[PDB]
C-alpha cells in the first residue's frame, strides 16, 4: 500500500531519528482544519519507517505556549548529546495573541515525545527583508564545525547561527539565502528550508508555487558553507507530481539519513486525490520515499510512489 504513511490529514513533516530510544519520529503540522487551524503538534513513531505509531500531543497553543493562540505549524527539531544525557530542541511557528503577525519559537525536551517545554516567548519576530513570513523553521548543526544554525521564510530565505544554549540566534550572523529568480515550474523560491550536509556538501531544499496547487514541488541548491551562497543545482527539481500515479503537490519536505548508513529518505506531504478541488491546501498527507545520490554528488530525482 505505501504511502500515505500517516493516517488523516498532516502535513510540511520533519522527521528524526532518536540515539536515545533508537526509533524514527515525525513532526507534522496537524492538518484537515481550514485555514491552517490547527494548535497543537502530535507526534508519530516507528521502527522500521513502515509502520507509524502516534504517539502523545507534544505542544498545544495558549495551553503549553503562553504567547501563541493557534496556527501550530511546521515544526523542526534537533537532537543533542550533553555531557550525557540527550536533549531536545523544538521549533515552530505559530500565531502570537498580539497578532502581530507569525513568529517563531523553540519548546525544549529531555525525550523525542517530550514532555516538551516552551521558552515563554518567540526568538524570530520580524523579516529580515521587510516582506514574507517567519513560518517554516529548520535547524542544522553543522558536523565540520559543530555550530547550529536556524534557516526558515515565506518569500526569502534567510539563516542564523543559534546561541550555545539554542534558544536565540545570533542576529549578526543572519544572511539571506534566498535563491535568486526560478519560475514556478524550475526553482521560485516560495517556503519550507531544509538543510542537511553530505560528504562534504551542504544541500538545501525548499519548496515551490502554494500548498493548495498540484505544481507544489521540492527542489534544491548546494553550497561549501551552512550560510551559502546557494547555488541552485542544474537540474533542481527534487520531488515533482505524478498525476498518473495520482501523486499531487508533493513539497514541504524533510530528510532523513539512516543512522550510521549513506541510506537516505525524503519525508513530504502531498494533496490527498479525493479533495483535488474541496480545500487541497489543508487536506494533506505525510508520505516517505527513497533518495539517492549520484556518484558526482548531484541528487537523483525522487520517483514518488502512490
Same mark, same amino acid.
Given at each position: 500500500s505505501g504511502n500515505p504513511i500517516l493516517p488523516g490529514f498532516h502535513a510540511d513533516p520533519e522527521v528524526l531519528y532518536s540515539h536515545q530510544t533508537k526509533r524514527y519520529y515525525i513532526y507534522p503540522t496537524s492538518d484537515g482544519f481550514p485555514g491552517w487551524g490547527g494548535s497543537y503538534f502530535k507526534v508519530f513513531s516507528s521502527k522500521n519507517l513502515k509502520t507509524w505509531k502516534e504517539e502523545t500531543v507534544i505542544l498545544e497553543m495558549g495551553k503549553n505556549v503562553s504567547w501563541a493562540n493557534g496556527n501550530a505549524w511546521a515544526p523542526c527539531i534537533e537532537e543533542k548529546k550533553i555531557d550525557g544525557k540527550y536533549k531536545y530542541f523544538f521549533y515552530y511557528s505559530a500565531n502570537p495573541t498580539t497578532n502581530k503577525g507569525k513568529q517563531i519559537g523553540v519548546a525544549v525536551a529531555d525525550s523525542p515525545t517530550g514532555p516538551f517545554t516552551d521558552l515563554?516567548? =518567540?526568538?524570530i519576530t520580524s523579516s529580515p527583508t521587510g516582506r514574507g513570513q517567519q513560518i517554516d523553521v529548520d535547524v542544522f548543526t553543522d =558536523?565540520?564545525?559543530?555550530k547550529s544554525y536556524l534557516y526558515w521564510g515565506n518569500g526569502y530565505m534567510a539563516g542564523a547561527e543559534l546561541n550555545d544554549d539554542m534558544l536565540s540566534i545570533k542576529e549578526e550572523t543572519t544572511v539571506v539565502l534566498t535563491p535568486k529568480g526560478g519560475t514556478l515550474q524550475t526553482y521560485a523560491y516560495r517556503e519550507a528550508p531544509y538543510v542537511i550536509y553530505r560528504k562534504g556538501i551542504y544541500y538545501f531544499f525548499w519548496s515551490v508555487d502554494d500548498t493548495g496547487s498540484p505544481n507544489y514541488h521540492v527542489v534544491y541548491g548546494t553550497a561549501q558553507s551552512p550560510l551559502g551562497p546557494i547555488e541552485v543545482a542544474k537540474e533542481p527539481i527534487v520531488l515533482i507530481q505524478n498525476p498518473k500515479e495520482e501523486i499531487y503537490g508533493p513539497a514541504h519536505n524533510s530528510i532523513l539519513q539512516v543512522p550510521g548508513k549513506d541510506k537516505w529518505y525524503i519525508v513530504y506531504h502531498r494533496i490527498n486525490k479525493n479533495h483535488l478541488n474541496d480545500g487541497p491546501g489543508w487536506h494533506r498527507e505525510v508520505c516517505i520515499d527513497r533518495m539517492e545520490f549520484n556518484p558526482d554528488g548531484t541528487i537523483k530525482q525522487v520517483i514518488p510512489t502512490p
Open positions: 515563554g516567548k =518567540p526568538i =558536523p565540520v564545525s559543530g
